[PDB]
Amino acid sequence: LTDEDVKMITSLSKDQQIGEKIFASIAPSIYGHEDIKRGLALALFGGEPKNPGGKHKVRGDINVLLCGDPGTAKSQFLKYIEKVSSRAIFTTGQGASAVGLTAYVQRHPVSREWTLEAGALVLADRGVCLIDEFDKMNDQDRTSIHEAMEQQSISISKAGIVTSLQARCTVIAAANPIGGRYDPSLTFSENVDLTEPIISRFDILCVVRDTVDPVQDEMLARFVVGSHVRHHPSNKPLPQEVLKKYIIYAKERVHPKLNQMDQDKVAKMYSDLRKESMATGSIPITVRHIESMIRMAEAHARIHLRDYVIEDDVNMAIRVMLESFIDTQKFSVMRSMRKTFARYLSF
């Protein structure tokens, strides 16, 4: 917290390239994966939480899953998010985790006082839990993360502590597909070992293919060796904490409101997309996706620091949500949807 923060953040927010400046300030120690830099930006800034009445839990958290063939900066991304976002913690599906997904009560060893060690999510109640190697978490952690992103409350009943600690997580995750290589012929769900309900609710699915290419590999190698020579022990976009002040400002103080979007356009959008997707083995776009679209719209409005979502923001949220959906879809159907919906992905 500080003052003059409003001055600096608004003064740069006037610039209106701020969306791309954020996209190029997120994850500078990684090459490519611009789709995932953008997607994690939308996850970081989030949407808004609402409850029409006291009856409907609609959430403001945008949950993300990178699925990637090995050696493609998944953990590098996750550790960037841990570094930058306040109330971030890290955890792994394997047993080497600094902090665990489950909640347990015991006598904590270094203090020998009888703690309720509430799990990773609850400890990241406001911000981000980061699940590296999301594809191997034990079944108890599967249960816990499912119940977290579904209920958004973790229901502990171990010793006599029959309580429910609220967990408003904004889960990021990384997963290695089966066989150590992405298989475009099969669909996302059946070439990643995450079951259907778990893979569903993640607001972004991203695919990371390590496609051999001359210029790409040349660029990547030059970047890595440059980092290495720069990080020899003889040599001893916006700054990251500037971005962090932007993050908290646009995450708490600014709540862009939505009465200013082509309601009919998006309704017919869902109509057309689902109408094309009507087919066998073609699990279609649904209201999950349309609410994710609104979340992404709000997130881009947040990112622009506006107080009112605009058609530009709605266009960008359409673009990213549709990109995620087509790349979830397998190759032939992906090409069909890409060809017939290039107008939105053009923007």
Binding site: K50, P52, G54, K55, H56, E291
Partner: protein, 39 residues
Amino acid sequence: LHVSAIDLAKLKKFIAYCRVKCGPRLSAEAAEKLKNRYI
């Protein structure tokens, strides 16, 4: 819903109220109609 965002407390209280107060138990004519439609 996204833009707009009896009562819930009243409804749950009413639910508990009905459950504790009344024991509904059908009449023979209703039982005979259910018999016919059951066959």
